[PDB]
Every structure is written in C-alpha cells, then in structure tokens.
Design a protein around this motif. Structure first.
Motif, PDB file in Angstrom:
ATOM      1  N   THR A   1      26.471  29.078 -12.860  1.00  0.00           N
ATOM      2  CA  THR A   1      25.150  29.191 -12.234  1.00  0.00           C
ATOM      3  C   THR A   1      25.022  30.374 -11.264  1.00  0.00           C
ATOM      4  O   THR A   1      23.929  30.699 -10.829  1.00  0.00           O
ATOM      5  CB  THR A   1      24.773  27.899 -11.480  1.00  0.00           C
ATOM      6  N   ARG A   2      26.132  31.028 -10.953  1.00  0.00           N
ATOM      7  CA  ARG A   2      26.104  32.151 -10.028  1.00  0.00           C
ATOM      8  C   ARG A   2      25.652  33.452 -10.669  1.00  0.00           C
ATOM      9  O   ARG A   2      25.652  34.511 -10.033  1.00  0.00           O
ATOM     10  CB  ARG A   2      27.477  32.336  -9.399  1.00  0.00           C
ATOM     11  N   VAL A   3      25.276  33.357 -11.938  1.00  0.00           N
ATOM     12  CA  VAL A   3      24.797  34.502 -12.686  1.00  0.00           C
ATOM     13  C   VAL A   3      23.293  34.382 -12.620  1.00  0.00           C
ATOM     14  O   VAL A   3      22.744  33.306 -12.846  1.00  0.00           O
ATOM     15  CB  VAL A   3      25.232  34.443 -14.166  1.00  0.00           C
ATOM     16  N   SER A   4      22.617  35.469 -12.283  1.00  0.00           N
ATOM     17  CA  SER A   4      21.173  35.409 -12.214  1.00  0.00           C
ATOM     18  C   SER A   4      20.633  35.077 -13.602  1.00  0.00           C
ATOM     19  O   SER A   4      20.901  35.778 -14.563  1.00  0.00           O
ATOM     20  CB  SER A   4      20.608  36.739 -11.737  1.00  0.00           C
ATOM     21  N   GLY A   5      19.880  33.994 -13.703  1.00  0.00           N
ATOM     22  CA  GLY A   5      19.320  33.616 -14.985  1.00  0.00           C
ATOM     23  C   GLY A   5      19.986  32.390 -15.579  1.00  0.00           C
ATOM     24  O   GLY A   5      19.497  31.816 -16.551  1.00  0.00           O
ATOM     25  N   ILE A   6      21.104  31.981 -14.997  1.00  0.00           N
ATOM     26  CA  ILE A   6      21.818  30.829 -15.489  1.00  0.00           C
ATOM     27  C   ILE A   6      21.764  29.672 -14.488  1.00  0.00           C
ATOM     28  O   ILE A   6      22.499  29.657 -13.495  1.00  0.00           O
ATOM     29  CB  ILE A   6      23.285  31.205 -15.789  1.00  0.00           C
TER      30      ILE A   6
HETATM   31 NA    NA Z   1      22.269  31.663 -11.496  1.00  0.00          NA
END
Ligand code: NA
Ligand SMILES: Nc1nc2c(ncn2[C@H]2C[C@H](O)[C@@H](COP(=O)(O)OP(=O)(O)OP(=O)(O)O)O2)c(=O)[nH]1
Ligand SMILES: [Mg+2]
Ligand code: NA
Ligand code: NA
Length: 325
Positions: free
Chosen positions: A92-97
DNA sequence: CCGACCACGCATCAGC
DNA sequence: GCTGATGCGA
DNA sequence: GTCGG
C-alpha cells in the motif's frame, strides 16, 4: 514525543486496520486516540488515566498498560511477525495501491519490491508511476526545497495570467520544516460559484508547469483537481532531487477560505472541526459551510470573509495553521 | 447493545 | 452515455 | 474501537 511511544503504537495499529483488516473506522478510532493523546500535555502513566480521554476506550487503555508495562505490544509483535500482512501493508506504500489491490497482489504471488517491477504489466498507469518513484516518494521534503518549489509554481502561474492566485497549503502552510508532498490551492477571478468564464483554467497551468519541465507525471487530472509529480531542476554533476508528489486544486475564488481551510488541514484537524461543525448544526467542506435542516439537508451557504469566520460559526477560537493538527 | 462514524475529486466498473 | 459503487488519495 | 441513540 512526550507520549511518542504510545502514539506510534496506536499509529502502527491503525495502519494495520486500514491496510490489512480494511477497516477505516478502526483506522480512524486509533488515529483519533493517538490524536487526542498527542495533544495530552502530561506524560501518561496508565490506561485508566488515558481512557478518561475521549477516543480511548477500554481496549486502547488495555494496550497502553501492556506497552507501559512491557515496553512493547504482543499484538503488534505478532502482526510484525506475519509475512502476509507485512507484505500487504508494504504494498500500500506505492501510490495507487490501496488495501484492496495490495491484498490481491499478495494473493497473486506478488509481495516484494522485486516482484512488482517484474510484473509492471499488472499495474495501471498510476500504480506504475508510484512504483517508478516509490523510493523517491518515501522521502519527506525539506522546507527549503518546498520554498524553491513554491517559488517556481507561483512564477509560472503569473506567467500564464496574473489574475491567478496560487497558495501552498498542507503541512507547509502549517509551518512544517518538512513535508510529505506539496499541496497547491489555485484561484482565478474567471471561476466562481456563479460561473466559469474560461475553459481549461486548470489545464493552462498544468501544461505550463510541464512545458517548463517541472511537472513530470500525471497520476490523475480533472478540471479542478490535479495529482501528479514534479522535480526541482538540479545543477550539473549534482545528484538530482527526488521526484515529489504534487497536487493542485482549483477552487471557486468566492470560496477560497473554506477551501484554504480544508487544504491546510491537517486531515485530522479537519475531521475534528467538521465533526464539531455538525455538533453546532453546520456542515463544512472545501467549498462552503451550510446550516443543517431537520431532514439533514444543508441550508444555503453562509458568507465567509476569513478562516476565522468559519471558526466563529462553530464557536471556536481562531487557530493559525501552526496550531492545526 | 447495535450502529454510525468528514467530505469529496478522479479512475473504473457493474448495471442499465 | 448515466447512476451508484468500488477504489484511491485526499 | 468508541461512544452515543
Ligand atoms: Na499506496
Ligand atoms: N476533510 C478532510 N481533509 C483531508 C483528508 N485527508 C487530507 N485532507 C486535507 C488537509 C491536508 O492538510 C490536504 C492534503 O493533505 P496531506 O495528505 O498532503 O496532508 P499534509 O500536507 O497535512 O501532510 P504531509 O506533510 O504532506 O505528508 O487535504 C480528509 O480525510 N478529510
Ligand atoms: Mg501535503
Ligand atoms: Na474515554
Ligand atoms: Na499531497
């Protein structure tokens, strides 16, 4: 810092409920508690004491006693010791996830920074960008870079039409010495609640920031909101600056205050005020502050000449951005 | 003791 | 197309 | 998870 240990514990938990258990309420509950605890001026010494605070029920009191007693929390040690969860949260630390896609991916066999790049074909444009700049986005922004960025934005804006008014809000406007990203409130006389006298008002500014090579990527982009990426120009032979997340929100100039209030936050400060609002009978949002009817229907928007005006309606003593959290 | 819990823009998808 | 909901990040 | 209807 005074109650840091506690508020960190509560924080990590909250994140586990949002990202794994996919329960925003428990997420908020934990945040709210950490929020009120961080504001508590005394150094806590028990859950009994803590509970007296609104937002700290028995559960959280119980964990506070455990933590204060053992310097740790078993529940948090377990979660940390479970690969599945630790992979989900990680994702979730990925923008968009968010929670949903992250979980799917751990289910589909993808759970490491390596796996992801090897399956770019599984990510959508946004998630793709969040991946490319993953490392860069993990970084906080020095207030001085912020300034260099605020400067660039305000100039290029003037260069498009000097009627535009651009304001950096978010943690910046609240006086933070560092920022997660950059939030930009925009306004132009040609766009108000009564009418939009120009087409592409937001577009003219976005494209200008790209033409000048400041804006590098576009996460999403409507006619009032822009989420993207940018980077400060660097000097030859000098490692480049990390790319940074940037948002630009175009608000009807006659609503500049509600919107500046909203966009200055913090998010938590906001939810509180909005909560308080409803308790005074009002409903606030980046656009206006309207009184609520019995049916629950908002009345006409009330006139606002300053952020303080908004605090007045709710009967709150003005708070300069510096004291909002 | 069950149920509500800020507010919304942008992308997308299911049903139509 | 549109409504309403999911998902995402504010 | 809390706390309020
Ligand atoms: Na994210
Ligand atoms: N009402 C409301 N406002 C929010 C919410 N989330 C974010 N915001 C507002 C206040 C923020 O200060 C602005 C965007 O904020 P950020 O996520 O960038 O927060 P902020 O800049 O305060 O933290 P940062 O230093 O950039 O990591 O939108 C929310 O859930 N509700
Ligand atoms: Mg910010
Ligand atoms: Na309490
Ligand atoms: Na942002």
């Amino acid at each position: 810092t005074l109650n840091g240990g506690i508020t960190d514990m509560l924080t990590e938990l909250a994140n586990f409920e949002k990202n794994v258990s996919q329960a925003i309420h428990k997420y908020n509950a934990y945040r709210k508690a950490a929020s009120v605890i961080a504001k508590y001026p005394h150094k806590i010494k028990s859950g009994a004491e803590a509970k007296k605070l609104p937002g700290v029920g028995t559960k959280i009191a119980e964990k506070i006693d455990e933590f204060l007693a053992t310097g740790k929390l078993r529940k948090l040690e377990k979660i940390r010791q479970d690969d599945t969860s630790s992979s989900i949260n990680f994702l979730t630390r990925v923008s968009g996830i968010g929670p949903s896609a992250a979980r799917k991916f751990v289910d589909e066999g993808i759970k490491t920074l390596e796996d992801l790049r090897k399956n770019e074909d599984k990510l959508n444009h946004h998630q793709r960008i969040g991946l490319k700049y993953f490392g860069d986005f993990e970084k906080r922004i020095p207030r001085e870079e912020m300034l260099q960025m605020q400067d660039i934005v305000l100039n290029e804006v003037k260069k498009v039409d000097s009627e535009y008014i651009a304001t950096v809000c978010g943690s910046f406007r609240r006086g933070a010495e560092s920022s997660g990203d950059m939030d930009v409130l925009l306004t132009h006389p040609s766009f108000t609640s009564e009418s939009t006298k120009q087409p592409k008002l937001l577009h003219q500014v976005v494209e200008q920031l790209q033409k000048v090579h400041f804006i590098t990527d576009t996460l999403s982009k409507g006619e009032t909101k822009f989420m993207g990426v940018c980077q400060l120009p660097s000097k030859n032979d000098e490692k480049e600056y990390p790319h940074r997340r940037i948002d630009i929100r175009l608000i009807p100039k006659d609503q500049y205050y509600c919107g500046v209030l909203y966009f200055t936050g913090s998010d938590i400060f906001n939810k509180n005020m909005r909560a308080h609002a409803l308790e005074k009978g009002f409903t606030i949002n980046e656009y206006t502050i309207r009184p609520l009817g019995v049916t629950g229907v908002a009345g006409e928007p009330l006139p606002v000449d300053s952020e303080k005006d908004i605090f007045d309606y709710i009967q709150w003593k003005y708070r300069e951005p510096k004291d909002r959290s």
